[PDB]
PDB file of C-alpha atoms and ligand atoms in Angstrom:
ATOM      1  CA  UNK A  22      21.749 -54.790  -6.148  1.00  0.00           C
ATOM      2  CA  UNK A  23      24.644 -55.202  -8.217  1.00  0.00           C
ATOM      3  CA  UNK A  24      24.438 -55.141 -11.969  1.00  0.00           C
ATOM      4  CA  UNK A  25      25.921 -58.282 -12.419  1.00  0.00           C
ATOM      5  CA  UNK A  26      27.097 -61.929 -10.786  1.00  0.00           C
ATOM      6  CA  UNK A  27      29.423 -64.595 -11.259  1.00  0.00           C
ATOM      7  CA  UNK A  28      30.394 -68.096  -9.781  1.00  0.00           C
ATOM      8  CA  UNK A  29      34.042 -69.286  -9.769  1.00  0.00           C
ATOM      9  CA  UNK A  30      35.145 -72.004  -8.641  1.00  0.00           C
ATOM     10  CA  UNK A  31      39.375 -72.455  -7.329  1.00  0.00           C
ATOM     11  CA  UNK A  32      40.075 -76.294  -8.183  1.00  0.00           C
ATOM     12  CA  UNK A  33      43.689 -77.686  -8.055  1.00  0.00           C
ATOM     13  CA  UNK A  34      45.825 -80.576  -6.364  1.00  0.00           C
ATOM     14  CA  UNK A  35      45.895 -80.312  -2.809  1.00  0.00           C
ATOM     15  CA  UNK A  36      48.347 -77.506  -0.979  1.00  0.00           C
ATOM     16  CA  UNK A  37      48.431 -75.404  -4.236  1.00  0.00           C
ATOM     17  CA  UNK A  38      46.706 -72.717  -2.420  1.00  0.00           C
ATOM     18  CA  UNK A  39      42.977 -72.406  -3.575  1.00  0.00           C
ATOM     19  CA  UNK A  40      42.578 -71.511   0.108  1.00  0.00           C
ATOM     20  CA  UNK A  41      44.761 -68.936   1.253  1.00  0.00           C
ATOM     21  CA  UNK A  42      44.670 -67.281  -2.476  1.00  0.00           C
ATOM     22  CA  UNK A  43      40.369 -66.756  -2.606  1.00  0.00           C
ATOM     23  CA  UNK A  44      40.475 -65.947   2.150  1.00  0.00           C
ATOM     24  CA  UNK A  45      43.774 -63.052   0.864  1.00  0.00           C
ATOM     25  CA  UNK A  46      40.813 -61.531  -1.883  1.00  0.00           C
ATOM     26  CA  UNK A  47      37.809 -62.088   0.121  1.00  0.00           C
ATOM     27  CA  UNK A  48      38.993 -61.536   3.222  1.00  0.00           C
ATOM     28  CA  UNK A  49      42.705 -59.529   2.475  1.00  0.00           C
ATOM     29  CA  UNK A  50      44.787 -61.234   5.345  1.00  0.00           C
ATOM     30  CA  UNK A  51      46.750 -64.690   4.347  1.00  0.00           C
ATOM     31  CA  UNK A  52      45.255 -66.970   6.714  1.00  0.00           C
ATOM     32  CA  UNK A  53      47.596 -68.016   9.243  1.00  0.00           C
ATOM     33  CA  UNK A  54      48.540 -72.345  10.049  1.00  0.00           C
ATOM     34  CA  UNK A  55      45.245 -73.190   7.091  1.00  0.00           C
ATOM     35  CA  UNK A  56      44.651 -76.450   7.300  1.00  0.00           C
ATOM     36  CA  UNK A  57      43.313 -78.142   4.048  1.00  0.00           C
ATOM     37  CA  UNK A  58      39.835 -78.322   3.029  1.00  0.00           C
ATOM     38  CA  UNK A  59      37.825 -80.460   3.700  1.00  0.00           C
ATOM     39  CA  UNK A  60      35.157 -80.929   0.963  1.00  0.00           C
ATOM     40  CA  UNK A  61      34.351 -77.091  -0.401  1.00  0.00           C
ATOM     41  CA  UNK A  62      34.337 -73.662   1.206  1.00  0.00           C
ATOM     42  CA  UNK A  63      32.307 -70.793  -0.573  1.00  0.00           C
ATOM     43  CA  UNK A  64      32.747 -66.718   0.144  1.00  0.00           C
ATOM     44  CA  UNK A  65      31.569 -63.979  -1.059  1.00  0.00           C
ATOM     45  CA  UNK A  66      32.329 -60.364  -2.625  1.00  0.00           C
ATOM     46  CA  UNK A  67      31.620 -57.508  -4.530  1.00  0.00           C
ATOM     47  CA  UNK A  68      33.489 -56.035  -6.418  1.00  0.00           C
ATOM     48  CA  UNK A  69      33.228 -52.324  -8.968  1.00  0.00           C
ATOM     49  CA  UNK A  70      34.599 -53.177 -12.130  1.00  0.00           C
ATOM     50  CA  UNK A  71      34.561 -49.258 -14.436  1.00  0.00           C
ATOM     51  CA  UNK A  72      31.611 -48.719 -12.424  1.00  0.00           C
ATOM     52  CA  UNK A  73      29.485 -52.037 -12.383  1.00  0.00           C
ATOM     53  CA  UNK A  74      28.773 -53.658  -8.898  1.00  0.00           C
ATOM     54  CA  UNK A  75      29.745 -57.115  -9.394  1.00  0.00           C
ATOM     55  CA  UNK A  76      28.678 -59.723  -7.372  1.00  0.00           C
ATOM     56  CA  UNK A  77      30.952 -62.947  -7.122  1.00  0.00           C
ATOM     57  CA  UNK A  78      29.709 -66.258  -5.611  1.00  0.00           C
ATOM     58  CA  UNK A  79      32.947 -68.072  -4.706  1.00  0.00           C
ATOM     59  CA  UNK A  80      33.395 -71.926  -4.411  1.00  0.00           C
ATOM     60  CA  UNK A  81      36.785 -73.069  -3.263  1.00  0.00           C
ATOM     61  CA  UNK A  82      36.875 -77.033  -3.502  1.00  0.00           C
ATOM     62  CA  UNK A  83      39.778 -79.915  -1.112  1.00  0.00           C
ATOM     63  CA  UNK A  84      42.556 -80.797  -3.784  1.00  0.00           C
ATOM     64  CA  UNK A  85      42.583 -83.828  -1.165  1.00  0.00           C
ATOM     65  CA  UNK A  86      41.731 -87.233  -4.671  1.00  0.00           C
ATOM     66  CA  UNK A  87      38.943 -88.400  -1.663  1.00  0.00           C
ATOM     67  CA  UNK A  88      36.915 -85.313  -2.221  1.00  0.00           C
ATOM     68  CA  UNK A  89      37.018 -85.368  -5.882  1.00  0.00           C
ATOM     69  CA  UNK A  90      33.959 -86.914  -7.359  1.00  0.00           C
ATOM     70  CA  UNK A  91      32.501 -84.301  -4.212  1.00  0.00           C
ATOM     71  CA  UNK A  92      34.085 -81.026  -6.033  1.00  0.00           C
ATOM     72  CA  UNK A  93      33.329 -81.810  -8.809  1.00  0.00           C
ATOM     73  CA  UNK A  94      29.902 -81.360  -8.997  1.00  0.00           C
ATOM     74  CA  UNK A  95      30.210 -77.921  -8.400  1.00  0.00           C
ATOM     75  CA  UNK A  96      31.887 -77.683 -11.975  1.00  0.00           C
ATOM     76  CA  UNK A  97      28.475 -77.428 -14.062  1.00  0.00           C
ATOM     77  CA  UNK A  98      27.783 -74.503 -12.540  1.00  0.00           C
ATOM     78  CA  UNK A  99      30.096 -71.795 -12.340  1.00  0.00           C
ATOM     79  CA  UNK A 100      31.846 -69.351 -15.027  1.00  0.00           C
ATOM     80  CA  UNK A 101      35.305 -69.840 -14.697  1.00  0.00           C
ATOM     81  CA  UNK A 102      36.532 -71.868 -12.801  1.00  0.00           C
ATOM     82  CA  UNK A 103      40.524 -71.074 -11.411  1.00  0.00           C
ATOM     83  CA  UNK A 104      43.348 -73.569 -12.102  1.00  0.00           C
ATOM     84  CA  UNK A 105      45.708 -73.865 -10.062  1.00  0.00           C
ATOM     85  CA  UNK A 106      49.768 -75.040  -9.570  1.00  0.00           C
ATOM     86  CA  UNK A 107      51.824 -74.810  -7.338  1.00  0.00           C
ATOM     87  CA  UNK A 108      55.142 -73.055  -8.821  1.00  0.00           C
ATOM     88  CA  UNK A 109      57.331 -75.274  -6.239  1.00  0.00           C
ATOM     89  CA  UNK A 110      55.638 -78.292  -6.674  1.00  0.00           C
ATOM     90  CA  UNK A 111      55.927 -80.006 -10.391  1.00  0.00           C
ATOM     91  CA  UNK A 112      53.475 -82.866 -10.275  1.00  0.00           C
ATOM     92  CA  UNK A 113      50.647 -80.848  -9.334  1.00  0.00           C
ATOM     93  CA  UNK A 114      51.975 -79.195 -12.357  1.00  0.00           C
ATOM     94  CA  UNK A 115      52.233 -82.728 -14.592  1.00  0.00           C
ATOM     95  CA  UNK A 116      48.404 -83.597 -13.163  1.00  0.00           C
ATOM     96  CA  UNK A 117      47.123 -80.107 -15.021  1.00  0.00           C
ATOM     97  CA  UNK A 118      46.090 -82.659 -18.827  1.00  0.00           C
ATOM     98  CA  UNK A 119      43.899 -84.466 -15.490  1.00  0.00           C
ATOM     99  CA  UNK A 120      41.832 -81.630 -14.791  1.00  0.00           C
ATOM    100  CA  UNK A 121      40.830 -80.428 -17.583  1.00  0.00           C
ATOM    101  CA  UNK A 122      39.863 -83.407 -18.979  1.00  0.00           C
ATOM    102  CA  UNK A 123      37.741 -83.534 -15.258  1.00  0.00           C
ATOM    103  CA  UNK A 124      36.644 -79.397 -16.522  1.00  0.00           C
ATOM    104  CA  UNK A 125      36.247 -81.077 -20.070  1.00  0.00           C
ATOM    105  CA  UNK A 126      33.342 -83.689 -18.891  1.00  0.00           C
ATOM    106  CA  UNK A 127      31.245 -81.957 -16.134  1.00  0.00           C
ATOM    107  CA  UNK A 128      32.501 -77.700 -16.002  1.00  0.00           C
ATOM    108  CA  UNK A 129      29.843 -75.888 -18.885  1.00  0.00           C
ATOM    109  CA  UNK A 130      30.671 -75.326 -22.655  1.00  0.00           C
ATOM    110  CA  UNK A 131      30.942 -71.956 -21.863  1.00  0.00           C
ATOM    111  CA  UNK A 132      32.946 -71.787 -18.829  1.00  0.00           C
ATOM    112  CA  UNK A 133      35.983 -69.815 -18.796  1.00  0.00           C
ATOM    113  CA  UNK A 134      39.478 -71.102 -16.944  1.00  0.00           C
ATOM    114  CA  UNK A 135      42.196 -69.402 -16.075  1.00  0.00           C
ATOM    115  CA  UNK A 136      45.750 -70.689 -14.954  1.00  0.00           C
ATOM    116  CA  UNK A 137      47.083 -69.379 -11.535  1.00  0.00           C
ATOM    117  CA  UNK A 138      50.893 -70.838 -10.393  1.00  0.00           C
ATOM    118  CA  UNK A 139      51.039 -69.923  -7.226  1.00  0.00           C
ATOM    119  CA  UNK A 140      53.673 -69.552  -4.733  1.00  0.00           C
ATOM    120  CA  UNK A 141      55.534 -67.058  -6.314  1.00  0.00           C
ATOM    121  CA  UNK A 142      57.475 -65.287  -2.609  1.00  0.00           C
ATOM    122  CA  UNK A 143      59.536 -69.036  -3.587  1.00  0.00           C
ATOM    123  CA  UNK A 144      60.338 -68.061  -7.511  1.00  0.00           C
ATOM    124  CA  UNK A 145      64.102 -69.050  -5.921  1.00  0.00           C
ATOM    125  CA  UNK A 146      62.285 -72.979  -5.277  1.00  0.00           C
ATOM    126  CA  UNK A 147      60.395 -72.816  -8.517  1.00  0.00           C
ATOM    127  CA  UNK A 148      60.088 -76.653 -10.008  1.00  0.00           C
ATOM    128  CA  UNK A 149      57.465 -75.401 -12.867  1.00  0.00           C
ATOM    129  CA  UNK A 150      60.545 -72.579 -15.073  1.00  0.00           C
ATOM    130  CA  UNK A 151      58.340 -70.184 -16.553  1.00  0.00           C
ATOM    131  CA  UNK A 152      58.826 -70.384 -20.169  1.00  0.00           C
ATOM    132  CA  UNK A 153      57.539 -73.766 -19.239  1.00  0.00           C
ATOM    133  CA  UNK A 154      53.404 -72.829 -17.736  1.00  0.00           C
ATOM    134  CA  UNK A 155      53.632 -69.714 -20.281  1.00  0.00           C
ATOM    135  CA  UNK A 156      54.131 -72.473 -23.514  1.00  0.00           C
ATOM    136  CA  UNK A 157      51.590 -74.962 -21.858  1.00  0.00           C
ATOM    137  CA  UNK A 158      49.203 -72.330 -21.747  1.00  0.00           C
ATOM    138  CA  UNK A 159      49.370 -70.736 -24.778  1.00  0.00           C
ATOM    139  CA  UNK A 160      49.236 -74.158 -25.596  1.00  0.00           C
ATOM    140  CA  UNK A 161      45.461 -74.363 -24.291  1.00  0.00           C
ATOM    141  CA  UNK A 162      44.208 -70.620 -25.736  1.00  0.00           C
ATOM    142  CA  UNK A 163      44.773 -70.710 -20.985  1.00  0.00           C
ATOM    143  CA  UNK A 164      45.089 -67.108 -19.308  1.00  0.00           C
ATOM    144  CA  UNK A 165      47.843 -67.739 -16.769  1.00  0.00           C
ATOM    145  CA  UNK A 166      49.341 -65.523 -13.895  1.00  0.00           C
ATOM    146  CA  UNK A 167      51.200 -66.129 -11.099  1.00  0.00           C
ATOM    147  CA  UNK A 168      50.186 -65.311  -7.903  1.00  0.00           C
ATOM    148  CA  UNK A 169      51.638 -64.478  -4.369  1.00  0.00           C
ATOM    149  CA  UNK A 170      48.659 -65.341  -1.384  1.00  0.00           C
ATOM    150  CA  UNK A 171      51.561 -64.626   0.590  1.00  0.00           C
ATOM    151  CA  UNK A 172      53.099 -61.600  -0.427  1.00  0.00           C
ATOM    152  CA  UNK A 173      49.826 -60.733  -2.272  1.00  0.00           C
ATOM    153  CA  UNK A 174      51.325 -60.781  -5.447  1.00  0.00           C
ATOM    154  CA  UNK A 175      48.168 -60.193  -8.253  1.00  0.00           C
ATOM    155  CA  UNK A 176      45.658 -61.471  -5.996  1.00  0.00           C
ATOM    156  CA  UNK A 177      43.563 -58.817  -6.702  1.00  0.00           C
ATOM    157  CA  UNK A 178      44.353 -58.537 -10.400  1.00  0.00           C
ATOM    158  CA  UNK A 179      43.607 -62.168 -10.626  1.00  0.00           C
ATOM    159  CA  UNK A 180      39.710 -62.008  -9.384  1.00  0.00           C
ATOM    160  CA  UNK A 181      39.038 -58.279 -11.232  1.00  0.00           C
ATOM    161  CA  UNK A 182      40.256 -58.887 -14.620  1.00  0.00           C
ATOM    162  CA  UNK A 183      38.405 -62.474 -14.368  1.00  0.00           C
ATOM    163  CA  UNK A 184      35.302 -60.291 -13.514  1.00  0.00           C
ATOM    164  CA  UNK A 185      35.998 -58.109 -15.963  1.00  0.00           C
ATOM    165  CA  UNK A 186      35.786 -60.551 -18.539  1.00  0.00           C
ATOM    166  CA  UNK A 187      33.054 -62.275 -17.513  1.00  0.00           C
ATOM    167  CA  UNK A 188      31.309 -58.874 -17.764  1.00  0.00           C
ATOM    168  CA  UNK A 189      32.505 -58.918 -21.402  1.00  0.00           C
ATOM    169  CA  UNK A 190      31.252 -62.304 -22.080  1.00  0.00           C
ATOM    170  CA  UNK A 191      28.069 -61.090 -20.513  1.00  0.00           C
ATOM    171  CA  UNK A 192      27.645 -58.319 -22.977  1.00  0.00           C
TER     172      UNK A 192
HETATM  173  N1  GNP B   1      55.193 -68.969   0.087  1.00  0.00           N
HETATM  174  C1  GNP B   1      53.846 -69.489   0.368  1.00  0.00           C
HETATM  175  N2  GNP B   1      52.925 -70.454   0.863  1.00  0.00           N
HETATM  176  C2  GNP B   1      51.270 -70.379   0.946  1.00  0.00           C
HETATM  177  C3  GNP B   1      51.266 -69.546  -1.040  1.00  0.00           C
HETATM  178  N3  GNP B   1      50.230 -69.645  -0.658  1.00  0.00           N
HETATM  179  C4  GNP B   1      49.802 -71.310  -0.008  1.00  0.00           C
HETATM  180  N4  GNP B   1      50.539 -71.293   0.573  1.00  0.00           N
HETATM  181  C5  GNP B   1      51.177 -72.319   2.242  1.00  0.00           C
HETATM  182  O1  GNP B   1      51.018 -73.551   0.781  1.00  0.00           O
HETATM  183  C6  GNP B   1      50.010 -74.998   1.387  1.00  0.00           C
HETATM  184  C7  GNP B   1      48.689 -74.559   1.131  1.00  0.00           C
HETATM  185  O2  GNP B   1      47.278 -73.799   1.149  1.00  0.00           O
HETATM  186  P1  GNP B   1      46.109 -74.240   0.960  1.00  0.00           P
HETATM  187  O3  GNP B   1      46.004 -73.022   0.764  1.00  0.00           O
HETATM  188  O4  GNP B   1      45.786 -74.254   2.357  1.00  0.00           O
HETATM  189  O5  GNP B   1      46.251 -74.939  -0.759  1.00  0.00           O
HETATM  190  P2  GNP B   1      44.716 -75.127  -0.739  1.00  0.00           P
HETATM  191  O6  GNP B   1      45.142 -75.135  -2.188  1.00  0.00           O
HETATM  192  O7  GNP B   1      44.106 -74.777  -0.248  1.00  0.00           O
HETATM  193  N5  GNP B   1      44.196 -77.819  -0.509  1.00  0.00           N
HETATM  194  P3  GNP B   1      44.015 -77.888   0.129  1.00  0.00           P
HETATM  195  O8  GNP B   1      43.374 -78.555  -1.407  1.00  0.00           O
HETATM  196  O9  GNP B   1      43.524 -79.023   0.587  1.00  0.00           O
HETATM  197  O10 GNP B   1      42.712 -77.479   0.831  1.00  0.00           O
HETATM  198  C8  GNP B   1      49.698 -73.858   3.155  1.00  0.00           C
HETATM  199  O11 GNP B   1      50.329 -74.354   4.360  1.00  0.00           O
HETATM  200  C9  GNP B   1      49.592 -72.950   2.936  1.00  0.00           C
HETATM  201  O12 GNP B   1      50.580 -71.728   3.828  1.00  0.00           O
HETATM  202  C10 GNP B   1      51.611 -68.363  -0.993  1.00  0.00           C
HETATM  203  O13 GNP B   1      51.190 -67.351  -2.250  1.00  0.00           O
HETATM  204  N6  GNP B   1      53.011 -68.535  -0.857  1.00  0.00           N
HETATM  205 MG1   MG B   2      42.235 -75.248   1.095  1.00  0.00          MG
END
């Protein structure tokens, strides 16, 4: 048995690396030749946060617009949403207001949302500056972290810090 169970759902545009992120955390390896998610995928992992056993239930949703009505049906039952963009794609960033709008209608009003900028191993090809992203997230009152599923940068920290904050929330 665990001390806590939380339901985390990753969302964001197609191609931003939501799958490689979940899989790198949950399996410990960056998945080679990863293809687009069809519908929603589900993964599990139990983690120790300061002696507490926390089971994460993680839903990994399709980016592709055509699955969008179905991925949205998963929001209401989530404890947290990991909203994801790709630092090297300005449009995935520019989309974010629209995602927050969705989350407002379809997620629960107790949902925690974090923002992840993925693919920092490609930092020199970013199209959204660190400062832009931090200013957007300061405006949204949203925790922001820059990750690399590929090279592991901040992938563990992402979910372990969110678990810790979900613990505090449950108390
Ligand atoms: N350099 C680099 N490439 C990455 C990283 N994370 C994912 N990618 C790549 O970017 C592409 C998209 O990855 P994927 O995890 O499928 O993204 P997704 O957000 O789940 N897409 P979908 O919504 O279609 O399921 C893949 O080619 C994957 O290898 C990263 O941290 N760095
Ligand atoms: Mg995917």
